[PDB]
Design a protein around this ligand. Structure first.
Ligand SMILES: Nc1ncnc2c1ncn2[C@@H]1O[C@H](COP(=O)(O)O)[C@@H](O)[C@H]1O
Ligand SMILES: Nc1ncnc2c1ncn2[C@@H]1O[C@H](COP(=O)(O)O)[C@@H](O)[C@H]1O
Ligand SMILES: Nc1ncnc2c1ncn2[C@@H]1O[C@H](COP(=O)(O)O)[C@@H](O)[C@H]1O
Ligand SMILES: Nc1ncnc2c1ncn2[C@@H]1O[C@H](COP(=O)(O)O)[C@@H](O)[C@H]1O
Ligand SMILES: O=P(O)(O)OC[C@H]1O[C@@](O)(CO)[C@@H](O)[C@@H]1O
Ligand SMILES: O=P(O)(O)OC[C@H]1O[C@@](O)(CO)[C@@H](O)[C@@H]1O
Ligand SMILES: O=P(O)(O)OC[C@H]1O[C@@](O)(CO)[C@@H](O)[C@@H]1O
Ligand SMILES: O=P(O)(O)OC[C@H]1O[C@@](O)(CO)[C@@H](O)[C@@H]1O
Lengths: 323, 323, 320, 320
């Protein structure tokens, strides 16, 4: 149908009978994403190196400033939570709208020096309180998400987006400057053949994780072992899980007893995308989306992917937790 | 000094007192790399999806055709070996020059659908025979390399290049259309803290590999376990090894008794780069660069990286091989 | 505050309390423009020249881009293009209420010299019945939105929806048009005249007399400067931003004039008048001409209102 | 076969048996041009307009790009720029044998209207001593290489090193200039004249008479067409590719003419003559003018040789 993300998002807003407020917020985020893609790809690098006679922190700050300014100037927001800011950012009264956005503007930027795929992750909620906006409006369960997505700056730039009717994939055509729809209503495989986690924490794994990893490598059913992949950049690993199937894990371990990854702006957004595509996303003890947030930078364990694989992991957890 | 790869390569050719033949071959390869970067990033995708009213195999073929045509039309080549062609490609007599090029035009393209970082790898030799050019001119030991490099199409596009005086790193500024020098004479750390291999082959590992992996996760020296990373795209994993240190392994295993990766156009080029940067690259039994090629698509085991780490692995190999 | 043309257009649609149909049509046109800009700047040329082993092709491509984008908007019923003999009636399934007249790549006969070139469009609401060519034959007064893209040293769009003219520049690093000037107004009187004086031999007495007044003023003022790119969007845009006058009048060899009413003259007239200028055939304001045929030609004189009025005073004076 | 300007320039340097010094200088200029093109097309404009929270700036940027790239080539000793009062003497450490005269962004006074604009350059071998402004004051006959970049609907470079004129187009998707025409030749006689007729009141008798012959021919031929962009590289390029004549003669108000000898007139003269055309002050071929000062102005008439000769016949006829 609509070819471009811009038309697609407009048309979905029309079908939803929206007033245009979420459409503007979505357009704003996606413009920030284009601006980030351009910087990640190093447009203007020659000027930094003295072409006219004249780094990861800078790109983190820039990416964060793109997202904040684009979202605030949309007139659709009241509260923003960023991975880069300690406190919630309350939108000026004059520019205040309905929505709350939790985002990680440039996830993986610590490893930009090796040119690892990196990404931007976001989740959007409606403010449901009647009182003045505060960080509390950001502390909603992931079940309350109105829309969420991620951009992956990989070999090409892609956006995964859901507004509650499945997951759609769009790719940036840089010669045109627009995202183009490449797959509508993507569904994750019921069972995959890839497992994705940092095995350098094997020494610190719980009994469940140790058992599950052993069976990936040494199956007891006569099947071939699963392949391993782990980029170390969440968006890259989660996106491969979506398109190829299998499992991605960052469980609690002895040194990170609450996991590493952040509930509000990493794990909730990807849990929503993955469930929208027919997969599962769990902490090990409940769905990620059912965790009731206590603090805006809260960490949780994360296990997600193909439902048969996530079920297998959960079985290890229950078994090893039982008397 | 020279800022751009183009000036840098010209100036190195001048210092070497070359006739310009290798400079033209290098310029030609780097132009093909720019053209590949553009396609990998999906310029013109909107036209494929019907913007004017009207895939991995296609990009493989395109990338291969860019490299071949650019190299042949340079007038610097006599024989080319590509990962994509069964037989060696003999340059037409009218266009024949001195050099032989072994290349993998788009390494990792099988996994382009998940937007994994991918790359282009090449090694250049001088034809030393007096007889008519043939695949034999491509069967030289890696010790005979005149120049080699790789392009990584990651979050940004980078080229690593060596012509025998260390490794230089260049990044593509897309707004300018030139590669810019970002690090001259890069040296790999003597010891790192990352190990990189597919642990899904644990069931098939030799005793050496099993022992080495166990000590990465469970050290016997009171140190923290190494972190694990494995993108599954060789250029991405090798480049991270270079900039961050540590070890990358694709050893022989029970199902791939000669390894997986290709001697001529994957392993020799990266072995050369890694040794030029002060690391080690071994098959497990000898340096990669000392392997005497028997066939243009020969596979070898590959272990490379920081010298203290590669030494530790080699120690496991010797110990487990001994009576 | 909206910065981008996409947010600007969306916000104006929310203010109009529109259903989103025109907004989608404008988004579609603008996407076509960005695609045309990329092609005009010769993205992918190395592939044409055999790296992996034209003016007609680009006319056809640009026409196909605009047609496809407009039809797939679901907002159109009838299109008129400079490139097509007949009006294009949108398939029933994709039908909406708007009629678009456009020239997808004006000035392309001369691409060879790399002259600035452009895309020109006017949008009408269908009034009635069952769609046909007649729906495209409304006078310019009935325009709902119009503008142009100029592919010059940078790519710019001039757009009006009835509340003045806004200017947007394409940032090719972003892929978005950025608002650079809101509510632009033409100077009351300028210091530049613009016409092909190579047709002097064929001018009417009024044009001859006016041109002579520009070069040899009688009131002690400095003579006007001359500029004529020969590409209509470049010459019209310069007149908008610096002021003065632009003329392609009737002459002995082109008695109806050269420029096309539906997709050249009406759109630029609308923009120039929205900016406080005048646009006339020498008989009538362009926007009041009732069109007789989709590829009809008219004379065109437009620009700063005091300069156009001085010209009309010469036309009226020499009439008998 | 070489396809790219980088390979083309390299191969011509290998054929010349050069040491690589001029080749490096040309690579440096061309890189400056690509950088200027990106800026002119407004890459990064959204950042200027506050996305993350001008004509002078672009003149200065373009001048800095060219100066830096040329100086860091290690191929230059003296530079003359339109933007700098005095010649720039290259630091001893970076010194080479070439002298470059350039206008980094010609036409930029009028960026506002998005007119085509350009970069113009001429390269000389220093003859002697110890570098100074005098090294830049050689006549155009001594040029080793020259050309221009036009930032029009696409970005093009015209380059000659003494063996004719080759044309290259920038493919912005690749970041490389692609050879589009080798050894271009201007038509012997064209059908377009190009000058600002707004200075008619100040023309000499020869110019007045010539312009009248163009509009009112006596031999039954069709009158010439008029084009005048007001941006020198756009008007000169069109004359190269379509033929005819381009004039900025002396007039009462500009008795020395307007255009600058070292970095506007000599470079385009060289290209036009390399292409089989003529370039004259009306007194002398431009390339034979011995320069008196680095920012000196001269009259300029250039183009198809038969049109320039018809003009010179009017100059000589009206001399007394
Ligand atoms: N562009 C869109 N795509 C999908 N759903 C939308 C869109 N716009 C609005 N909606 C739905 O309508 C609700 C109200 O929209 P709004 O009136 O724009 O705040 C949102 O919270 C969404 O659930
Ligand atoms: N651009 C360059 N950079 C580094 N070394 C070069 C370059 N050009 C030539 N050489 C060296 O000189 C040898 C002969 O160059 P050629 O005469 O160009 O075939 C090469 O095989 C290189 O070892
Ligand atoms: N994006 C927009 N910008 C300015 N005016 C608009 C916009 N959308 C709609 N309008 C006005 O509202 C009318 C109806 O809009 P629509 O319901 O989309 O056909 C149009 O014909 C315009 O006059
Ligand atoms: N790239 C080139 N293209 C054409 N002619 C060249 C080139 N390089 C050098 N030449 C000619 O050879 C001379 C000496 O070159 P160089 O040794 O580089 O200063 C120049 O002044 C030119 O006349
Ligand atoms: O090195 P570890 O501890 O395995 O961390 C990797 C994780 O941390 C990040 O926040 C850092 O890149 C995620 O993108 C990723 O999943
Ligand atoms: O899935 P496995 O067997 O671990 O293969 C990965 C290797 O194979 C490739 O040829 C395929 O991407 C290399 O780029 C990479 O190192
Ligand atoms: O050669 P002339 O007759 O002066 O034509 C110029 C006009 O023609 C065009 O349609 C281009 O050929 C317009 O863009 C321009 O104003
Ligand atoms: O306004 P005029 O006097 O006709 O000036 C036009 C000339 O001036 C310029 O230097 C630009 O202002 C040239 O690019 C052009 O040919």
């Amino acid at each position: 149908d609509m070819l471009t993300l811009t038309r697609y998002v407009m048309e979905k807003g029309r079908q939803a009978k929206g007033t245009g407020e979420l459409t503007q917020l979505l357009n704003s985020m996606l413009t920030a994403i284009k601006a980030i893609s351009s910087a990640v790809r190093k447009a203007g690098l020659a000027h930094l190196y003295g072409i006219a006679g004249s780094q990861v922190k800078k790109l983190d700050v820039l990416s964060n400033s793109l997202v904040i300014n684009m979202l605030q100037s949309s007139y659709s927001t009241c509260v923003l939570v960023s991975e880069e800011n300690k406190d919630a950012i309350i939108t000026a009264k004059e520019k205040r709208g309905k929505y709350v956005v939790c985002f990680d503007p440039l996830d993986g930027s610590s490893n930009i020096d090796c040119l690892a795929s990196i990404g931007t992750i976001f989740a959007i909620y409606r403010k449901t309180s009647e009182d003045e906006p505060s960080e509390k409006d950001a502390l909603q369960c992931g079940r309350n998400i109105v829309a969420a997505g991620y951009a992956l700056y990989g070999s090409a730039t892609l956006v995964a987006l859901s507004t509650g009717q499945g997951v759609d994939l769009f790719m940036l055509d840089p010669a045109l400057g627009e995202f183009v729809l490449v797959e509508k209503d993507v569904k994750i495989k019921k069972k995959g053949k890839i497992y994705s986690l940092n095995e350098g924490y094997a020494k610190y794994f719980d009994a469940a994780t140790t058992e599950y990893v052993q069976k990936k490598k040494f199956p007891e059913d006569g099947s071939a072992p699963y392949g391993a992949r782990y980029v170390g950049s969440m968006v890259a690993d989660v996106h491969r899980t979506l398109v190829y199937g299998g499992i991605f894990l960052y469980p609690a371990n002895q040194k990170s007893p609450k996991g590493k990854l952040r509930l509000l702006y990493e794990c909730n957004p990807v849990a929503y995308i993955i469930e929208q595509a027919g997969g599962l996303a769990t902490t090990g003890t409940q769905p990620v989306l059912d965790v009731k947030p206590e603090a805006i930078h809260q960490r949780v364990p994360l296990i997600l992917g193909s439902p048969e694989d996530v079920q297998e992991y959960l079985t290890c957890v229950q078994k090893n937790q039982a008397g």
